[PDB]
Curated annotation (Swiss-Prot), chain A:
Subunit structure, interactors included: May form a homodimer or a heterodimer with a related family member. Interacts with OLA1, TMA17, and UBR1.
Record's miscellaneous remark: Present with 4700 molecules/cell in log phase SD medium.
Name of the gene this protein is made from: RPT6
Protein name stated in the entry: 26S proteasome regulatory subunit 8 homolog
Record-stated family: Belongs to the AAA ATPase family.
Residue window of the full protein shown: 52 to 102 of 405
Organism field: Saccharomyces cerevisiae (strain ATCC 204508 / S288c)
Function: The 26S proteasome is involved in the ATP-dependent degradation of ubiquitinated proteins. The regulatory (or ATPase) complex confers ATP dependency and substrate specificity to the 26S complex.
Swiss-Prot record, chain B:
Xref: InterPro entries: 26S_Psome_Rpn2, ARM-like, ARM-type_fold, Proteasome/cyclosome_rpt, PSMD1_RPN2_N, RPN2_C
Entry protein name: 26S proteasome regulatory subunit RPN2
Superkingdom in the source lineage: Eukaryota
Disulfide bridge positions per record: none
Species: Saccharomyces cerevisiae (strain ATCC 204508 / S288c)
UniProtKB/Swiss-Prot annotation, chain C:
Record note on domains: The JAMM motif is required for the deubiquitination and degradation of ubiquitinated substrates.
Function, as annotated: Component of the lid subcomplex of the 26S proteasome, a multiprotein complex involved in the ATP-dependent degradation of ubiquitinated proteins. RPN11 is the only catalytically active member of the lid and serves as the essential deubiquitinase of the proteasome.
Protein name according to UniProt: Ubiquitin carboxyl-terminal hydrolase RPN11
Record note on quaternary structure: Component of the lid subcomplex of the 19S proteasome regulatory particle complex (also named PA700 complex). The 26S proteasome consists of a 20S proteasome core and two 19S regulatory subunits. Interacts directly with RPN8 and STS1.
Gene: RPN11
Transmembrane spans: none
Organism: Saccharomyces cerevisiae (strain ATCC 204508 / S288c)
Note: Present with 16400 molecules/cell in log phase SD medium.
Similarity remark: Belongs to the peptidase M67A family.
Record PTM: N-acetylated by NAT3.
Curated annotation (Swiss-Prot), chain D:
Subcellular location: Cytoplasm; Nucleus
Domain of life: Eukaryota
Protein purpose: The 26S proteasome is involved in the ATP-dependent degradation of ubiquitinated proteins. The regulatory (or ATPase) complex confers ATP dependency and substrate specificity to the 26S complex.
Gene name of this polypeptide: RPT3
Family statement: Belongs to the AAA ATPase family.
Modifications after synthesis and translation: N-acetylated by NAT3.
Protein name: 26S proteasome regulatory subunit 6B homolog
Provenance organism: Saccharomyces cerevisiae (strain ATCC 204508 / S288c) (Baker's yeast)
Amino acid sequence: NDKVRFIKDELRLLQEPGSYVGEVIKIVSDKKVLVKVQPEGKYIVDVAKDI
Amino acid sequence: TTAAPLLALLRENQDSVKTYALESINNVVDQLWSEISNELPDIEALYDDDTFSDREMAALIASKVYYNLGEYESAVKYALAAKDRFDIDEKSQFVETIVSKSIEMYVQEASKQYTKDEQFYTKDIIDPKLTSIFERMIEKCLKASELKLALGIALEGYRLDIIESALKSKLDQSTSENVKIINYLLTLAITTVTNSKFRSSILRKSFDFLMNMPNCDYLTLNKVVVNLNDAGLALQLFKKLKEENDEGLSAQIAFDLVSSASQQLLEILVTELTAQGYDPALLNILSGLPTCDYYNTFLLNNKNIDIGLLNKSKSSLDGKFSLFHTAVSVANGFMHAGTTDNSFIKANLPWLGKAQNWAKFTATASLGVIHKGNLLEGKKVMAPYLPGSRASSRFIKGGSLYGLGLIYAGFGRDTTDYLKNIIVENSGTSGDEDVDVLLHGASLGIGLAAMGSANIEVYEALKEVLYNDSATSGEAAALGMGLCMLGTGKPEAIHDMFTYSQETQHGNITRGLAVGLALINYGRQELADDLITKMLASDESLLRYGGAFTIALAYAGTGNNSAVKRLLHVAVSDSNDDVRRAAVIALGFVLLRDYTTVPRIVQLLSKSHNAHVRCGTAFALGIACAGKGLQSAIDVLDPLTKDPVDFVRQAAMIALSMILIQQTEKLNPQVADINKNFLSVITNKHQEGLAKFGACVAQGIMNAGGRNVTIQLENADTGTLDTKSVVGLVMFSQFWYWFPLAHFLSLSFTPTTVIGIRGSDQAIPKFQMNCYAKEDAFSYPRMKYSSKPYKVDNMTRILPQQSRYISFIKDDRFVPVRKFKGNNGVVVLRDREPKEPVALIETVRQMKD
Amino acid sequence: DAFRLIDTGALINNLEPRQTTSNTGLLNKANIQALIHGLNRHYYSLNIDYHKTAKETKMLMNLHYEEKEESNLAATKSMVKIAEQYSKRIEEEKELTEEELKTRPKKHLSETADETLENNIVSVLTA
Amino acid sequence: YFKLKKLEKEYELLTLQEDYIKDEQRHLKRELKRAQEEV
C-alpha cells in the first residue's frame, strides 16, 4: 500500500521546480554560502537548518 | 501381547466364553487397540443381537475403538449404550472426555433444531440419550456450588427447564446474592447469546424470578423491561409501587424510564395508567417535561464558557469567503446549548448583515439548540422568526421551523397541529420558489416533533411532497419521513421509498431517500436483510451510500459477525469514494458493545489510500469511543492531523473533540497540545478554506454547554441505546452535503451531574455530598489517585471519573436508594423523620408554575 | 472542467448556490480560483461527474469463437520456431546466470523467466 | 466463564481482520497497475 501511496503522491514532487547545480567557494559567519552556478552567475544562499 | 487370543473366543457360542472374552478386552485396551480396529465388525455384530445382553460392555469397548483413532463422532454413540457400565464418578481420561464430547454435540444439535421449534427439549425431537448425560453434569456443578457454569451451560443449549429448576432451588432469604446471579444471567444473555428470540425468552423468565422474592432490586426490574421493550410487564411495576409507594421507590422508576423507554413505550404507560388512576404530580415526568427543565438551571448558572472564545473566532474572518458563516453558528449553538443565551447574536450587528439567505437560514436555526430545554418559551422567543410575520426573506421563516423542532423534538405534540396544517395546505399548492422554502422548513420541524411516532397522517402528509417534481422542498421530505419510521416502522414504506428513489431524477431527493431507508429499520438485525440485499445490488451511486447506514442502525448495539463482513466488501470492491467512506464509518455503530476493540480495526483501515476512506475511519473512534475515550484512540488519529489534505483535517479535529470532552491535567495530558492546535488553525491565515472549518467545530464540541455536558450514546443502567442520542449522531456524522447538519448533535448531549430529589415535597434539597475527588487530583478545566475527601452541594459539575466516590451525608436526614452506581444522573433520595424543610434550590419551574 | 453562466432565480445579486460540496477542490490555474463567492458572474469553478447504467457497463466489456481462432494464430506460427523460440530463451538465461556469478541481475533474470512461463502454458492450451 | 466467551469473540475479530487484508491486498494489485500507468 505504501508503494501505491508514494506513486500517487509523486505528482506533487513532479510539479516541484527542482534544483540547480553549483559549487561552494567560501563561507561566512552569517550561515551564507557562496554557490557558483556553471551556466548562471553566482548566488549567496543560506545553508539548511539540518546542516 | 496380541489381541488375537482374546478376540478368537467370540466366534463360538457360549454364555461364559462370550462374557470372559469381552471382559478381558475392557481391562487391557491401550495395549491391544491395534488389532481391535480390524476386529471391530465382529464386535459390533453382537450389539445388534437381542439375545446378547453384554452389549453394554461391548458398546463400551466399541466406543474406545474410534476413541483411540481420534474420531469422537461415533465414540459418543456407543458409549451411551453402556448405561450403568459407564461410571460417572470414575473420573478417568475416558470418562472426563466422552462426557465433555457429548456436551459439544448437545450444543450443535440444539441450535439447529431451535429454529424449527423452541420446545424441542421437552419433545422427543432431541436425542434423549444426550439429555440424560447432559443433566448429570448439571448436578455435578451443584455439588461444587457454582451458579455460573450451571446457568451458563443452559444458555447455549436453549433449554428453559434447567434455568427454572436450578435458580429457584438456590433462592435463600439473604437475597442480595440471588439478585446478582440473576443480574449475571442478563449479561451472559447478551454477549454469548446472539439470537433475539432466546434473549427475549430469558427476559420474560428473569422478570418473574425477582417478583417471587419479596426483596429485589428495583433498578434490575426496569433493566429487564427496557431490554425486552415490553410495556405489559412495565405496568406491573407501577401497580406494585402503587400501595407500596415510597419517597425513594416510585420516584426513582419515573426518571429512569425517561431516556430508557422508546416513543411507543411512553405512549402506553400514560394511556393505561390514566384509566386506573395515577399520581397527578407525576404526570409530566413520564412525558419528560420537567426533565429538560431540571437541567436548564444547571446549565445557566454553572456555565463556564467565555464570550471571548466565540468573539476571536468570529471576528477572524468576515465578508469574503462566506463559507465560514456556518462554522460560526456551529460553535455558537453548542457552547450556548441549554443556556438560552441570545446575547451573542445581537452583540455583533455586522455579522447579521453579511449573512445571506442560506447563512441566515443557519443563524435563525441556531436558536433551537441554544434555547433547547424550555418548551414554554420555545415558540415565544422565536415568534418573530416564525411564519405569519413579514420578514426580509423566505429562508428566515424556514430556519425558524427547523429550529422549532430542535427544542420540541419528541415533545412536538403541541406543535404537531401547527406544522401539519402548514404541510397540508402546501401539499396541494406547490411548485413556486417561495412556497417550497416554507415547505422545506416545515418538513424539517415535523420530523423531530414526530420522531419516533407511528402516526400515519404525518407520513402521508410528507409522502405527497415528493410527488410535485420539485427538489427545493424535496430534500426535507426525504429526511422527515425517516424519523417517523424509526424502530419498527411501516412495512409498506420500504418498497415505496425504494422504488421511487430509482425513478427520481433529482439529486438531493435520491440521496435523501437512501438515508431515510436506514432510519426505517432500527434494531431489525437479520430482519432487515431483505432491504439490505436490494440496496447493495443496485448500480446507482446514491443507493449504495445509504445501504451502509442500514446495517449500522439495524445492527447497532449488539452486532453480528456477518454484518461487519458485508461492510468490508462494499468499501473495497466499489470504486465510489462516497460509498467506501460510508461503510467504514458504519463500523462504529456495530462496535458500540465494546469500545476497547474499536481502534483495533480502525488502525488497519486508517493507513489505507483514498483519503475519503481515511475520513470515515476517523469518525469511527468518534462515533463509538466518544462515550468513554481511550489513550490508544489518540495515536490512531495522530497521523491524520498532519495530513495536508483539507477535508481530512476536518475528520481529525472533530473526532478528537468528542473524545476529549472534559479532559484536563492529571486526566488526559494529551488534551493540552490538541486543544491549542484548534486555535492555531484559526490564528494561521495561510490555511485553506476547509482547514479552518474543522477548527471552529472542534473547539465548539469540546466547550459545548460550558463543558457541563458530554456526548455519550449510552450509559449502563438498563443496557440499551438512547433513541435520541444514537439517531441524532447519524445526522451529525455526515457534514459533507449540507454544512450545518451538526445541529442534530444537541439531542445526544448528556449532562453529568448528581441531582437529589426529596420524595416528601418532590423538590430539590441542598446539602453537601461526601466524595474523595479533590481539585488537587480530579479537577475540571476553567477559564489516578485520591486521598483527601471533598464536599460539594447539589447541581454542580461532576466528571464521570468523579461520580464513583459520590456519597450522600445522612446527618441532614436524607436516605439514598440508588447511592452510587459509578455514573452520574438523578438519584432519588428519602427522608427519615420529616419535620420542616431544610434547604431548597430554585429552578426555572418556580417562575413558570 | 466546466464553467456555467448565471441564470439566477436562486441568486439575484449575491447568494450561496451549489449545494452538495464534497470530492475534489478548486485546482484550475490562477485567476479563476482568485474570486469564487465574491464574483460568481462570468467564471467560477465546478466539478465533473459521469453517470453509468448496468447496460452501458457491458458495452465496453466486449474487448475480451472469433477470438478463439485469433488465440491459436500466435501458436500456429510458433510451431515452426518452437525449436528456435525456446533456444533463444535458454541461451539468454545462460548469460543472465553468469551475471550473478560475477556480482560477488535478479530483476533481468526474473523478467526473462516470466515471459517463458506464460508461453509454455498457452502451448498446453492448444492441446 | 466470562473470559471463556471473550476468546471466541477474539477469533471473530481476527477473522474480520484476516478477511479484510486478503481482500484489500488483492485489491491493491488492481490499484497498483492503475497508479503506475497513470503517473
